[PDB]
Amino acid sequence: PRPSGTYAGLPIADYGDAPPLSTKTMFWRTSPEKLPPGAWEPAYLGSKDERVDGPSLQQVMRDQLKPYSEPRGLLPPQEILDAVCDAIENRLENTLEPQKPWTFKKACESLDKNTSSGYPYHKQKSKDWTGSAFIGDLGDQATHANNMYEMGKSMRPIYTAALKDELVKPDKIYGKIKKRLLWGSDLGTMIRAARAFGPFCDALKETCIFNPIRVGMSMNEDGPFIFARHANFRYHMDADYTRWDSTQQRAILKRAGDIMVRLSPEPDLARVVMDDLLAPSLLDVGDYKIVVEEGLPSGCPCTTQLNSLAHWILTLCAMVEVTRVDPDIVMQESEFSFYGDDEVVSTNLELDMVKYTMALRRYGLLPTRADKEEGPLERRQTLQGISFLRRAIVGDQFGWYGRLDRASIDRQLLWTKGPNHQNPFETLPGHRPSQLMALLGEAAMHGEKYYRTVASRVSKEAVVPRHRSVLRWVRFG
Ligand SMILES: Cc1ccc(C(=O)Nc2ccc(S(=O)(=O)O)c3cccc(S(=O)(=O)O)c23)cc1NC(=O)c1cccc([N+](=O)[O-])c1
Ligand SMILES: [Mg+2]
């Protein structure tokens, strides 16, 4: 750890080991025809992107790192924070079934084998996986990490920075180029965090309908119940935060982590891992590993739950600050849904929206109105039209459900995933059945008319069910 200075506003701690940022996309066009105006396309691919002449990917990454050197917003008032945290912990103790510890074997099995091991080998995890265990280098890395876990010994996570290959609005390619920062965790940290927090994460997933952290929900199976519950409350809103992860305070995440640790079956071992996760983070940006003291270190498996929990603490602190009602009463009078930064907030309380917005902003968060104008967040008295997990919530005669917007459905027709390549507009030879049947489902939820337009598009080239049938399957079966 010898070099020094400042990289993208953040301290340099060492030289970096990360491989080069990706110059390819997994998205291919489904026909050679020209795309409509305003059509979304895969994010910028760097100096070799034929579509535009933009900055280096490393510069694009430096842009994403800016928010992490911004100053934090403020802690909620301490007396409110303490009471909110207690009420959250208490609700979780009243609902979660105690779990057994996770074994090394279980931890290994849980890892997604089709992503990278991160530092130091940067290889797809499948490559040292036998079907039942890690061998070779990953085996060594995993076993060592597991030993350290069992001994309650600290290890420093090393995260690897990347940029997300996804379809984006054209202006993010042909205007001011943007591309989203991803933190990839090192396999050692994944093994330790899996063993320590997999149990809590499982317990919490079993309650995803009765508790606000919805991670693990099935939209088609649980959405109807989840949204029917929200609708029992009068006022509905969604703060639609900007840059949620980069604006988090580690002090808040430490509060969320404390709760996770105390509700874990190996709390002394889990405490060591959570402290490592929340200590100033080492992020490999290629040239340098830099130190990031603030924001969400979003590599590991449990981080969505941790982030969700931090979301819960802040939303509730803001509501208590403004309404001056006790946390437990706010919770009696509300239904929340959280998935990382994504929220739905339903309440019977008459919130002073201007005062609510100001408190969120005082905490360093960046809530945004639907019109992106300045001023206070808005609320409505129907759940319908609020979104969660990229679906509009819709109510009808049969009940509530989540519907994918037409535009997202169109997009999945224009593009298909396949191996990585350099030119997005290239069509993939050689035809995705189950994915077609799913698309018909979503199309169906928009009526027979739109369903039929999508149904023709699907027939090419390529068992096309009737609207009424498929609707019934997706809504009820
Ligand atoms: C965030 C997100 C973004 C894109 C997709 C998604 O469906 N992507 C795609 C999958 C498969 C294909 S395929 O090539 O035809 O097989 C896609 C093809 C084109 C475009 C997409 S995409 O929507 O633009 O990514 C595809 C899914 C998600 N994930 C969710 O909607 C999601 C996340 C967590 C939980 C739930 N959920 O419980 O409903 C749903
Ligand atoms: Mg939302």
Residue numbers in the entry: 3 to 433, 436 to 466, 474 to 488
Question: What is written in the article reporting this PDB entry?
Answer:
Norovirus (formerly Norwalk-like virus, NV) is a genus of the Caliciviridae family that is a major causative agent of non-bacterial acute gastroenteritis in humans. Among these, nonstructural protein 7 [RNA-dependent RNA polymerase (RdRp) domain] plays a key role in genome replication, as well as in the synthesis and amplification of additional subgenomic RNA. Notably, since RdRp is not present in mammalian cells, it appears as a suitable target for inhibition in the context of antiviral prophylaxis. Inspection of the crystal structures showed that 6 binds to a site located in the polymerase thumb domain, more specifically in a cleft along the exit path for the newly synthesized RNA.
Six mNV-RdRp molecules are hosted in the crystal asymmetric unit. In the murine protein compound 6 could be fully modeled in all the subunits of the crystal asymmetric unit. The observed roto-translation of the ligand is related to the loss of the interaction with Gln439 and with His433, both pointing toward the solvent in mNV RdRp. On the contrary in the mNV-RdRp/6 structure, the inhibitor could be completely modeled thanks to the different disposition of the naphthalene head due to the loss of the interaction with His433.
